[model samples]
Target: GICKSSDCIKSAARLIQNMDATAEPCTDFFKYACGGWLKRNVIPETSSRYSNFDILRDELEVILKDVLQEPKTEDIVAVQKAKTLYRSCVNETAIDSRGGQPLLKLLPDVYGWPVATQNWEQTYGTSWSAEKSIAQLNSKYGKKVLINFFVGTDDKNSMNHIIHIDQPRLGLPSRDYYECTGIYKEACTAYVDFMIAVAKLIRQEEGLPIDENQISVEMNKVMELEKEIANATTKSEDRNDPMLLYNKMTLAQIQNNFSLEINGKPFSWSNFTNEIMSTVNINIPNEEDVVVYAPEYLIKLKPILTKYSPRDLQNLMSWRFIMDLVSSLSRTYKDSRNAFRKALYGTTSESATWRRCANYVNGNMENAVGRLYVEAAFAGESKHVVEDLIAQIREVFIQTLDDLTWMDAETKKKAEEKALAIKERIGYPDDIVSNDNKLNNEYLELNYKEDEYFENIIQNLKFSQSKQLKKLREKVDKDEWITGAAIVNAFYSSGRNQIVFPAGILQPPFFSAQQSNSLNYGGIGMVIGHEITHGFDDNGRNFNKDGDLVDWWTQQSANNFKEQSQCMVYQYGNFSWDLAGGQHLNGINTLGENIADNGGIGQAYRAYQNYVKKNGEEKLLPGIDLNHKQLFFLNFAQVWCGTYRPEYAVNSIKTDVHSPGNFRIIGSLQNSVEFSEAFQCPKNSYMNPEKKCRVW
Candidate 1:
């Protein structure tokens, strides 16, 4: 029987267009599934990577643009502010007219950049303080330069909000770039050149004399300082274990243990913490508790801080601040950034002004923008449909637990309990769409001027910073949404033991009421299972059902879990990505996601089987010869159909936890017995390896 529905026919047409019948699924499933699609789709000039996710996000952005651009008769204050912010960002003429004036003015307020001025020591030296500069950068501009400090729910307590301090993000994508050779060396050199370019531009705009040689020399110092800092920072693979990273200490303990000296006198953590907290009108006591994610980095930072001169250190901080604000500046600054981006990610052009503005407004005021998106584009009924899907997948996960031999009875019971306890947030949050007053109140503090685009950005940053800091005095709101509804991605928050699927992902290729249950299962069903399986992944398993970091598993079960995980680590590590210049994937850094993928797909297949048992076999798509079972795996592979630039691929291989698209499909399916069974792959075929790895 063929599915004659319009949606089914459309889906069949799309699947046919994306597939290559000549390719053998038993040897390379990705090519068989996505060869035609890959050949037709080209990565956009402005983008470093192109994928199904990016394509969907592009569609969502277009819808958002229309919503933001349209004028409503009875617009709320929040909506009005969002529109104003968008207009200000899109107003290139106004931005160009005030070229560099706003940044030049702000430079002195944040302690003038040593590189820009010839007599920085005389004019701003008396009042300049590193602690004060760092505080203002954080409290006003939301820039975490030397120290990454913020408030979040305590991992262990899962109840109280506590302060967290960790290693700062480097100017480059990863620390590997600072140390590696070949393309990485080229990227580092280009970064330094970019820094000098920005500084010279600033100097020219400020009417200060441009000494290119002096500027280059000073910028290189900043680069060297960052390289040292990067060396001190821990690698992503090394920081995978939450238990190993969680180091709780009182303010006094941190001050005593990691004694830092800037000049002749000791640098006081009390003074530094007080200055930052005071900006948000919060008083910090010496006994206040804070979690330091990387104390070893802080220890290494002490000696590095003492080695650098005050001017050199100030130059580094100024460079970081400038880099953060460069996007909000004029075209000249953006063009400079494009040059650097070309070297880093191989992006040939900048995003269109309207697209950039829409993204800016959407990210800065997500709730207001999300409300608009929900009203205009989101399907309200999809929420219920997705909720039912989550329940089905979760039930499948619980049923599958009985068959696992590695997990002992005690751990298995707890794991099943965690799966049952897993919370699901589907589509848009109710308050963002239905509760007008509440949504407006969330953005009440933000006041966007119609013309002051840069100023508006600063105000928003301050408002966001204050809102985060205020959490220190408030109780943890477990039910609160972590991300906006307009996003195209899904999330699994271990702190909340929750999975979130925004309205943006609930469409064709992911889910629809009209699509066959097989396609829906392969699409969003796999995603739902992935998030649910995340609850029992390597990192998420450390947290109990209550979302507290606890050792709930017995020693034997824990050991067995590690043994199972090691197989996957070795398996994924063996995949050498030629797209990333033959760089191998980081097995330890990506182990959690790999586990989720393997478990997610397996669970989705069984769940689809259960759906068939309840509702009978689904009708095949029109003109498609594949059975419902093959269609299920086909759709799963198509979801990961995409490509990346060599530069972007190389960088992401170091930073992103998820593997490349091809590997995500290849690695997961290689271990999937259901896929092999459906496709009738030979026992020793590439897709049906004799060995398989699984951990959930």
Candidate 2:
């Protein structure tokens, strides 16, 4: 058929096309493997970065689009609803015709937006309190105005779901945007400009009296208030350390600790908690335990909250409400957000409306989307193949543990036990996707209006909000998927001691049943190993085998691990990203992912070695002169190929837990003895350093 169905043959062509013969694989493997790919591929106008991950994601989105855009059939109510919501989302003409009317209708008088209506000050009749408004906002729209409360499995008591109150996320990617000087100062200015511009458009669209100068002043005030909030936010590195963040307290403790003066009078934090919890129908005692992530931030927020007048706080809240709901309205608001994206993330253009709608439908209605996608595109037979890969990787990981000289025997045994116990969740959820009845029931409460896209978003928000609140009274469902199946990503849940390979990431260039063992092992094998290694990374190591947040390492082993990990911290930190004005990587912030990267590749290579031991070394692809061993490492490095815009690189360095793709390849491979051996890197060469960091 001349289809090139043979994976080895196809991969040979791809590898030859992507490689740069001029670059030395020993010194610069990233460029050696991805130079051609980087040179040929341009970042899409709609994207901030383009890479193998994004490439695969774009392909998957098209497959999903075909499934979603199909003519409706007699299916479960939930299934039908996904198609309908998608249709509404893509109908830009209808949305443009409605203008901002749908969103204007949802804005209450209490939370009056001055830009949307004249004399909005009297909307609340001067009785609107910040506490009341905050509670109402949380309950109605799930907006985290000041404090965020959600339901999750209690850290101390893993079986029960409990209420968690944490610091609110900033409008920017991180607190640094508001607080950092130099490059970020420019970004903060852009935020202010975008905020004021959006409010003006919203005002003009509603046929309300426009005040350009007055609104700009108010929006500046709003931005200032947000910066204050950002000041109290916890740093990302400290937040990543689970032990440092997990603080359990009774409701009374929180009430007393978070209390401050308001309007020359003591604001009752106890009353605020009662009002918020009761509003969501979560009935709990004052002595009931709640998990608070940032107690220090809560303490710091006391004076900030007290500094702003009640009316000033209300104005900020009003602005936040509109900003959150802006995109759901019309093209004008959407364009404003798109412009903000360009400023914040360096995104060039907005994706097509149909693609955006498809994304929305897939995210909210995952199980429904999963059913259709899995039925048509999912390779269920490949599940067993991945299961085999996981076993091989696990075995190789255990063997590597025995070779570690720094680890004590007791700690080594525990590590092996944990590795053996790692639960493998491949493909998609069973009953949810395979069973129409289950998929239907999952979204039974969610009903959407096909013609009203804006209102439908609001409806989904309420549904999802109530759904989480309902869990406050229920127990944690261990089998429930944390992410949807249609996403092109993999995950390792430390709480469940499980690795999840969603149906979305099971296709090429991550994995394929038809692919050669070398490519499959290098691609999805590395991903699987990466996720498995996460179970033992700096953060996951805090949790025991059963996912309990208890330390299990011996004192000596723990110290040695920290020492070894510090090397990685230093190694990665030394690499400068040129895009963001030569901003170096944050070693401590990205240490966890860096650890996983090094360990995952090592383990995958070892597993590939074991595969060859069982079935002799694979033959080279016809067009490529490289052996299977070199091919394995080449494919491994190629997966991370991508280019980033300066704006995105800057933002990602501040907030992302991973290093840049080039450094991810360089840093990890430089640490691998196997990589040096396979590539025949000269002794003491750039890639073949005398000293290298190793922690598994």
lDDT on C-alpha atoms for all candidate structures: 0.87, 0.81
Clashes of each: 0, 0
Candidate 2 at residue 63, lDDT? Answer: 82
In candidate 1, what are the lDDT values of residues 430-512, reduced to their tens digit?
Answer: 88777889978888777888889999988877888888888898889977888898999898999899999998889889898
What would the TM-scores of all predictions be?
0.98, 0.96
Q: Candidate 2 lDDT, tens digit per residue, 405-484? A: 99999999999998888888878888866577777877887777878888888888777777777777777787888777
Question: Which runs in model 1 stand beyond 4 Å of their true positions?
Answer: none
Model 2 has an lDDT value of 0.81
Error of 2 at 211 (Å): 2.5
